Amino acid sequence: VSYLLDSLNDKQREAVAAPRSNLLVLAGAGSGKTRVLVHRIAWLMSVENCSPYSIMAVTFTNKAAAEMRHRIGQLMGTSQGGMWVGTFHGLAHRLLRAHHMDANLPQDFQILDSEDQLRLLKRLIKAMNLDEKQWPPRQAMWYINSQKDEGLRPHHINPVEQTWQKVYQAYQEACDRAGLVDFAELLLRAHELWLNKPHILQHYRERFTNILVDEFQDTNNIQYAWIRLLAGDTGKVMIVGDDDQSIYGWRGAQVENIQRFLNDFPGAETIRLEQNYRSTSNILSAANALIENNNGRLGKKLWTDGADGEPISLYCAFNELDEARFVVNRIKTWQDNGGALAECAILYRSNAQSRVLEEALLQASMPYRIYGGMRFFERQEIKDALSYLRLIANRNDDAAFERVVNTPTRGIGDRTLDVVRQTSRDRQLTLWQACRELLQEKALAGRAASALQRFMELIDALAQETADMPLHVQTDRVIKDSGLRTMYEQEKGEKGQTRIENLEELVTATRQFSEDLMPLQAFLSHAALEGEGQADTWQDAVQLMTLHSAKGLEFPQVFIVGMEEGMFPSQMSLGGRLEEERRLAYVGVTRAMQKLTLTYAETRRLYGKEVYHRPSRFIGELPEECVEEVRLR
C-alpha cells in the first residue's frame, strides 16, 4: 500500500484506494489517469485480495491496452493469467472464441478488417451480376457499415436502397455461411451472446466483478450497453473519462455516456482529477474559461503547481499564406534557441489546411511529418485527381493509367487488365497503346471493350475540353467529369466531405501555383516532388495534424491555425454541433505544455476562391488576461 500510493496526489489516492464501488473518475487533461487505472488494479489485487481473474480493463486502442499491460507488469509482473485487458473489439473477440458454438460461429471463425471487407464485397457484387459502375463495392461497404453502426440487420425486399438492402442481405449470408465477422459484428454478436445465453452471462458477471473502462466519453451506444449488461447489479465498475474531451461524435461517440453511468449505477460517485502536470497555469486558466461556454457538462477547474507561464500568442494574418509563414518563423526562433522541431505541433480543424503549411515548411527547408494522416499530395483523393491530370499530360503514363482506369469503379476487371499488361509487355507498348491495339483487334470480351472504350474517350475528351482552360479550371473540370466528386458525395457523411475538402484544396493549390514549361507539367512535377514525403530517414521534424489526431498528445509549443468562424467552428455546423467543436478546441488548448499560439487569417482561398471569415468565437471566449496579440513594432 505504501508503494502503491507513494507516487500519487490526493485525488489520485482517493480513486486508487476507494472501497469497491461504482466510481466515475472524471480525469482532467494531463491528470495522470493511466497511473490511476494501473495503481487501482494493483490495489484491487494487493489490498482488496481480488484475483487477477476478476479484473477486466477495457481500453480505447490497442496501444492503450499494451501500455496498461506493461505498466501493470511493472508493479506486479506480466504473469497475470486471468486478467482481461484489451479493447472492446479484442475482448468481444475473446468472448466469442470461448463460446463460438453458442454464438453460431464455427471453430476457426475469422475477423474481416476494412480491406478484407472491401475485397469480399468486390466479389459479392460480381457474383450477384450487378453493374459495379452503378453499384460500387466501396459504396456497398459504406452502406453496410452505416446500417451495422445503427444496429440494423438486413430486412425484406423504384428503390435504390432496395438494391443496397439486397447486397447487405447477401453479405450477411456470405459471412454467416463462412464464419466471417466484421468489426461491428464483434460487439453485436458479443452483446447477443449475453442476451441469449443466461448461464454464459452469469459466468462472466460472477467472474469479472471488477471492471474498468478508459476514455469513457468516447464510448458508443453498443459499447455502453455491453458494459452495463456485464456489470448487472453485482459488478463494481470504475469508468475513467472527461466529458469535456468527447470529440468523436461523428464516429458514434456519446458524450452523454458519462452522465448515463451516474444515472444507471446506483453506487456511483464522482472523483475529479483536476491537478494537471502538463500545462502552465496561464494555459489552464484559458482552457477552464473556454469550456465554461458549453452547457452539457459536469464541470471542473484544472490547476497546476507548475509554471505560471507565458501569454497565449494571438496573430491575425492577412491570409493563409501570411499565416503559414508566421508559424514557420516562430518555430525557427524556437529551433535557433535550441528547441527540437518535434516539440512543436501545428494543429488544424480540417486536414486540407495542412497544404499551405507543408508548402511553407518545404520552402524553409524545415522537416515536418503529418501525425495520424498523409501529406496532402499523398492523400488518396489527391493521388487519384493527379493521375487524371497525368493522363491528360501524357497518355503513356502507365502508373497514372493503373491508378484510375477503375477509379471510380467502371467495371474494368482484373482479367481484362491482365491482358492489357501482357500485351504492353510483349509488344513493348505503353498500357494506353496496348489498349488502342487490342480494341482495334477486337481482342477483348465485348463487356470489357465497352467500358474501356468509354474510359479512353473520357480521358481524351477531358484533355480536349480543358486544353485552353487555366490550370485551376481544368483541375475543377477534371474532378467533376472523372466522377471523383460524385464518388465521395454519394457516401453521405463527414468522411466523404473531408475528401471533397481536399479535392477543393487542389483547386486552390493549382490556382496559387499558376513556374512554367507548361503550367500542367510544371505543377505535376511539383506535386510529384513534394521523392519527398515519408522519408525512411528519421529526422527531428515539426508535427502537423488535425485537432482530432492530437487527442492525448502533448507538446512544449502548440500552434492552432485557422481560428476562423466557418473553419473552426466548421461550417458543416451551420448549437448542437457547436459544443463538440468547443470540446475539440479545448482538447487543442490542453495539448500545450509551455506555449500556445492561436492564428487566423482575414481571408482564406477555398476551392480556388477568396473567402472572408470573422475570427473564431473561441478566441474571444478566452480571458483577456491570458492572451497577448503579436503585432508589428
Domains of the chain (ranges, CATH numbers): 1-111+185-273 (3.40.50.300), 112-181 (1.10.10.160), 274-375+530-631 (3.40.50.300), 377-527 (1.10.486.10)
After which residues does the chain have a break in its backbone, defined as C to next N over 2.5 Å?
157, 514, 530, 574
Instruction: Flag whether 32 is marked binding.
Output: yes
Neighbours of 296 (CB within 10 A): 12
- Which position among 214, 218, 320, 505 bears the catalytic label? 214
In degrees and rounded to multiples of 5, residue 239 shows phi and psi of: -105, 145
- HEC per residue, 195-261: HHCHHHHHHHHHHCCEEEECCHHHCCHHHHHHHHHHHCCCCEEEEEECHHHCCCHHHCCCCCHHHHH
In degrees and rounded to multiples of 5, residue 298 shows phi and psi of: -65, -35
Answer yes or no: 33 catalytic. yes
Answer yes or no: 398 catalytic. no
Neighbours of 99 (CB within 10 A): 17
Instruction: Flag whether 35 is marked binding.
Output: yes
66: Cβ contacts below 8 Å, ≥ 6 apart: none
* Cell numbers describing residue 79: 504473469
Please check whether residue 145 is in contact with residue 184, taking contact to mean a CB–CB distance below 8 angstroms.
yes
Give the resolution value in Å: 1.8
d(CA 554, CA 395): 47
Neighbours of 158 (CB within 10 A): 4
Instruction: Flag whether 604 is marked binding.
Output: no
Please check whether residue 168 is in contact with residue 128, taking contact to mean a CB–CB distance below 8 angstroms.
no
Please check whether residue 214 is in contact with residue 64, taking contact to mean a CB–CB distance below 8 angstroms.
yes
Helix axes 221-231, 257-264, angle to 10 degrees: 20
Rounded to a whole number of angstroms, the CA Rg of the chain reads 27
Report CA 295 to chain centroid distance, whole Å.
26
Counting DSSP H helices and E strands in the chain, the numbers are 26, 16
Instruction: Flag whether 442 is marked binding.
Output: no
- Which position among 117, 217, 245, 510 bears the catalytic label? 245
d(CA 353, CA 129): 42
Q: Which amino acid is at 134?
A: Q
- Which position among 11, 12, 33, 474 bears the catalytic label? 33
Answer yes or no: 409 catalytic. no
Answer yes or no: 383 catalytic. no
DSSP 292-358: TT-SS------B-SS---PPEEEEEEEEHHHHHHHHHHHHHHHHHTT--GGGEEEEESSGGGHHHHH
- Which position among 215, 243, 320, 476 bears the catalytic label? 215
* Cell numbers describing residue 328: 514557420
Answer yes or no: 215 catalytic. yes
- List the beta bridge partners of residue 315: 599
Answer yes or no: 243 catalytic. no
Please check whether residue 563 is in contact with residue 619, taking contact to mean a CB–CB distance below 8 angstroms.
yes
Please check whether residue 347 is in contact with residue 591, taking contact to mean a CB–CB distance below 8 angstroms.
yes
d(CA 13, CA 27): 13
